[PDB]
Write a protein that holds these residues in place. Sequence first.
Motif, PDB file in Angstrom:
ATOM      1  N   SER A 100      -0.336-125.085 -77.087  1.00  0.00           N
ATOM      2  CA  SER A 100      -0.837-126.761 -77.326  1.00  0.00           C
ATOM      3  C   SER A 100       0.280-127.399 -77.614  1.00  0.00           C
ATOM      4  CB  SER A 100      -1.968-126.711 -78.344  1.00  0.00           C
ATOM      5  OG  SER A 100      -2.845-127.971 -78.220  1.00  0.00           O
ATOM      6  N   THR A 190      -4.093-120.270 -79.540  1.00  0.00           N
ATOM      7  CA  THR A 190      -4.530-121.005 -80.753  1.00  0.00           C
ATOM      8  C   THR A 190      -6.117-120.980 -80.787  1.00  0.00           C
ATOM      9  OG1 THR A 190      -4.659-122.622 -79.077  1.00  0.00           O
ATOM     10  CG2 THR A 190      -2.628-122.534 -80.420  1.00  0.00           C
ATOM     11  N   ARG A 194     -11.978-119.519 -83.239  1.00  0.00           N
ATOM     12  CA  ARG A 194     -13.150-120.421 -82.782  1.00  0.00           C
ATOM     13  C   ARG A 194     -13.974-119.440 -81.765  1.00  0.00           C
ATOM     14  NH1 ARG A 194      -9.902-126.238 -82.398  1.00  0.00           N
ATOM     15  NH2 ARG A 194      -8.664-125.865 -84.533  1.00  0.00           N
ATOM     16  N   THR A 209      -8.033-125.058 -77.162  1.00  0.00           N
ATOM     17  CA  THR A 209      -8.558-125.686 -78.568  1.00  0.00           C
ATOM     18  C   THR A 209      -8.027-127.162 -78.663  1.00  0.00           C
ATOM     19  OG1 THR A 209      -6.448-124.814 -79.564  1.00  0.00           O
ATOM     20  CG2 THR A 209      -8.217-123.505 -79.739  1.00  0.00           C
ATOM     21  N   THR A 211      -7.502-130.071 -81.908  1.00  0.00           N
ATOM     22  CA  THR A 211      -7.680-130.425 -83.461  1.00  0.00           C
ATOM     23  C   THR A 211      -7.313-131.809 -83.679  1.00  0.00           C
ATOM     24  OG1 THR A 211      -6.953-128.032 -83.737  1.00  0.00           O
ATOM     25  CG2 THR A 211      -7.389-129.407 -85.616  1.00  0.00           C
TER      26      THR A 211
ATOM     27  N   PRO C  77       1.681-119.289 -85.159  1.00  0.00           N
ATOM     28  CA  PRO C  77       0.459-119.300 -84.764  1.00  0.00           C
ATOM     29  C   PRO C  77      -0.675-119.531 -86.113  1.00  0.00           C
ATOM     30  CG  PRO C  77       1.624-117.233 -84.217  1.00  0.00           C
ATOM     31  CD  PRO C  77       2.391-118.002 -85.174  1.00  0.00           C
ATOM     32  N   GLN C  80       0.468-123.509 -87.504  1.00  0.00           N
ATOM     33  CA  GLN C  80      -0.018-124.743 -86.660  1.00  0.00           C
ATOM     34  C   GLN C  80      -1.420-125.032 -86.944  1.00  0.00           C
ATOM     35  OE1 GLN C  80       1.689-124.543 -82.542  1.00  0.00           O
ATOM     36  NE2 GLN C  80      -0.559-125.342 -82.098  1.00  0.00           N
ATOM     37  N   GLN C  81      -2.220-124.122 -87.315  1.00  0.00           N
ATOM     38  CA  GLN C  81      -3.495-124.568 -87.414  1.00  0.00           C
ATOM     39  C   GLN C  81      -4.083-125.079 -88.874  1.00  0.00           C
ATOM     40  OE1 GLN C  81      -3.557-124.109 -83.813  1.00  0.00           O
ATOM     41  NE2 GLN C  81      -5.935-123.831 -84.226  1.00  0.00           N
ATOM     42  N   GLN C  84      -3.454-129.879 -91.577  1.00  0.00           N
ATOM     43  CA  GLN C  84      -4.312-130.870 -92.355  1.00  0.00           C
ATOM     44  C   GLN C  84      -4.357-130.050 -93.754  1.00  0.00           C
ATOM     45  OE1 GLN C  84      -4.190-131.864 -88.628  1.00  0.00           O
ATOM     46  NE2 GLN C  84      -5.803-130.417 -88.659  1.00  0.00           N
TER      47      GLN C  84
END
Lengths: 265, 265, 265, 265
Positions: A100, A190, A194, A209, A211, C77, C80-81, C84
């Motif tokens: 991404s 990524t 999910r 994905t 976000t 990996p 990056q998620q 937030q």
Amino acid sequence: DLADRFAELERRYDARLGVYVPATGTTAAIEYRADERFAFCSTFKAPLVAAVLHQNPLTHLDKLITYTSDDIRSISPVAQQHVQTGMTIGQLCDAAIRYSDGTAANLLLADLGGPGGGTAAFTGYLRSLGDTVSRLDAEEPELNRDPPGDERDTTTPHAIALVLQQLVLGNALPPDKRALLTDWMARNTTGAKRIRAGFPADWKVIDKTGTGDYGRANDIAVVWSPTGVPYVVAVMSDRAGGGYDAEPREALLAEAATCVAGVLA
Amino acid sequence: DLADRFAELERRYDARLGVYVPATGTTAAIEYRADERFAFCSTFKAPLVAAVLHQNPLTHLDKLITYTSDDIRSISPVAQQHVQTGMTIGQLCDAAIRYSDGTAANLLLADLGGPGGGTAAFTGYLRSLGDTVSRLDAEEPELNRDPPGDERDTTTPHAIALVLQQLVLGNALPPDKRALLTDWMARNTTGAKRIRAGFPADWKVIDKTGTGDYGRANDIAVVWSPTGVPYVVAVMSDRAGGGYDAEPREALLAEAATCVAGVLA
Amino acid sequence: DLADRFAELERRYDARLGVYVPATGTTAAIEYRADERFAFCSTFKAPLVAAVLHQNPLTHLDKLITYTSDDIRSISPVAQQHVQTGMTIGQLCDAAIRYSDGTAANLLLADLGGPGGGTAAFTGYLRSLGDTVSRLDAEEPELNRDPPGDERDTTTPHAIALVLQQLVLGNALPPDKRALLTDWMARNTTGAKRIRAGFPADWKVIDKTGTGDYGRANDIAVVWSPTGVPYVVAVMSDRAGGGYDAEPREALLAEAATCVAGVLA
Amino acid sequence: DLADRFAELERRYDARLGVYVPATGTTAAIEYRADERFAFCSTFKAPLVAAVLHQNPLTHLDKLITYTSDDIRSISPVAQQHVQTGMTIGQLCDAAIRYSDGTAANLLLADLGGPGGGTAAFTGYLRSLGDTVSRLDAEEPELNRDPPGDERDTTTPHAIALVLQQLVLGNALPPDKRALLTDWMARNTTGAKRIRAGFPADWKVIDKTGTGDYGRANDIAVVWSPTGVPYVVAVMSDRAGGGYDAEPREALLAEAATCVAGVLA
Ligand SMILES: *C(=O)/C=C/N[C@@H](C(=O)O)C(C)(C)S(=O)O
Ligand SMILES: *C(=O)/C=C/N[C@@H](C(=O)O)C(C)(C)S(=O)O
Ligand SMILES: *C(=O)/C=C/N[C@@H](C(=O)O)C(C)(C)S(=O)O
Ligand SMILES: *C(=O)/C=C\N[C@@H](C(=O)O)C(C)(C)S(=O)O
């Protein structure tokens, strides 16, 4: 009613859930807020890759693109390591799908070419797949930050699903071009927590994905049954009530997908 | 209306399916043929080890048990490799659960003592746990091949689901013993393709399988949602119409377990 | 004369190989280019976590660290998620070892504090353990791309093998910390094709991998015989003769391991 | 050299070890007590089913054999559950390979036909494969308990290797028949704690075990390297000094196979 469980998870995670599974010959379609608009976020990088694939011959991939420090604007784990060397269009497809990479996307968008970085070229490509709803108006990362209620850079679980059905299962690309896109999605890095986390392991899962702010979390996938039957799953969500900096809830998407698996089994 | 999906599977596989999932504070109990009898097969070994554990101090596990060649009457992948050394009650517990070892289960039944090699003693332990329907009338491998309609060596998905619940989740055992059975089952090696295969990989699954003639295939399990909530899932099935030699369909069990998973998310 | 097999693999994979296994009581030390310098690559993240563990109480692991997009500079990996939500110092330790996450290692280096992101500190921690040879001068991903012959960001299979022996088998960490590092290294997900692939399955293997440019491929590990004897294995290789883009060869590492395994049996 | 590790395990396990790996084009021959005689035990059933395969056409497999309770004389896990129904020749093959069923072997011997349960017939098929040394004189379970020094019911790690090489890697059987033998040996269920436990997991391993009194533990296998190279490994062992009821040491075999694996890598 599967929808009651889909309306339970919303309350449980305090979110807005959108789901769409295109109906097959053997199964009805699954619909929850299917035609409500959700922000693309990074999921537009799937149809973005197939666009470049569709307008250009296989050799276009070996074209090198150079860029500078000012071109890196969003999360770009691959692009930041090749600012000196430059990347070949193929590498920017691999970076854009699997990791991404935001910069590779903006670049692949400019490679489409046209107004405002060829966003219009992109929507255009979505219109020749029969999708008249979706649109892309900004670039990375502004497209993630549009406020709710705004229709820019939005899509619908109904409309993206069919797009991905055409691209991976249909004839939108020739097979040898369809082969590259699928692989990039099958090796995406990524989407672990999910859709991939809600389907049993002996199901195959390719996905992209997405976000963003307002607790936005999307995963669009093509999953295969252990007997080889394909289906398309679209799950989109946001938590606007929490505001701009609300936290996206991955578990919601994984829990949703498990509901789809149960009905698809 | 999960009963429709279960009735669709029965058709697809030419089998009779039985499922039970005890109620939880949040969820209702799932029931398909829940009060019909199916054959125990090798699912009786989980409460068999409980009964052995229950009546004995922990020290008893080290007691060595020796046997002869004429004792190996069914498949005994472990006991067959220790006929000269002998085995302790613990190693017999481990084998009877983890490898469904046949000889282990008969020696355990014998260690329970009493009439008919301790089958009666086993059934009395189930009566003491409230189980009013289950019964064990024979040993391995005879208890796997009773003709259809014969009530000997049968249980019900409803009955066994409640025993398993008390042994693992309840207080039928003290913590130091309960922790052994849970481990042995957590490391079962014969059910990768059943309940384990219908549940995502972030769900913890401990199980004991059972297989017999007339296309019989069961699996009893405790599952922990990713968040930590435990559920008990009894899945049993037979294909007694196809005759003695009918072939078990492990995929039926997995598919039903995937149906239960969507409902439990 | 195990040095004849190692050399034959060097010829076969067009690579330079380094191997160290410290001497136990029963066995001698296994050495090949043992005192030669090889790039750290990601193998530095194992003592780094031990560094953070050592200088801080256990509850420091709940400290919340927030970062931004610019901080994602290599493949990350996990990091990056969570842009937030932010990550804890516990989660960063997890991801630096198990997914070799790059952003997590960089953040931790900062948490160590000091000159240039804490690389002077990381080094100093090694000097306190006895390592007078290794050195860490850059961050992720620059530390993977040093040209051959340079000493920046390098260790030696001899030197690292002894650091890992103290951190895990010795007492450089109190038991409660030590057990966290041991557990994280036991659940590594990047070393399936390296040392792990070179030992029989009934040997327990914990490990951290390293990869970089110039076909660099390392893997450091502690392994336990089936009877429970611990050994430390330090395998490192590059192919710097094939230039920057040379492909690493994991099977070289899985084969060397298979050689060390036979000698240790 | 490798012979000094092989003379260590003997001391370590208080046993007599015999290893033979026939030389290939790329590797030399591993030899330790290679021509010393060791008891066949239950490894003669590998060449046995091949013999039945050889002098009969594929349809002879469907022939049915009835028997009685008095025929059940050794560990017969599969043959004891078919006294009433009876068994086909092929079931007697599968049973005698995968489960080492004693009764099924003694029936296969009698199917080859001739003097004294047809043992001479069996040796009569070994010489035709060039094996001048080995011999079979008794039936299960007597062939397992001849005293040390005696030569009845013996082979040698050199003499049984080259039969298993011809019988799996050569032209001793046509492909049709070759396929069946090989499959049965890749599905064996009695050799998990021997050669299979000493080779890495990415090496393929097919085997037929043998166990008897005087601590006699054998395993013969054909193993494939991760790249596809086949090898024949013959490990045989007894502990004649500890008496008739000496305990066999499976661990010795695993360790010897790990020692074979190291040079072969
Ligand atoms: C993919 O196209 C983008 C997602 N952006 C988010 C992310 O988690 O990466 C933000 C909001 C953090 S971003 O635009 O940097
Ligand atoms: C571990 O030592 C390495 C991380 N990065 C390297 C890799 O091979 O993954 C790079 C430099 C190629 S990267 O940051 O992707
Ligand atoms: C061949 O498969 C051998 C069996 N022998 C022994 C075993 O442990 O399996 C005995 C002791 C059972 S035997 O002399 O039959
Ligand atoms: C316990 O009931 C389990 C397994 N045994 C059956 C099997 O399918 O393996 C038998 C009885 C058929 S067996 O020969 O072990």
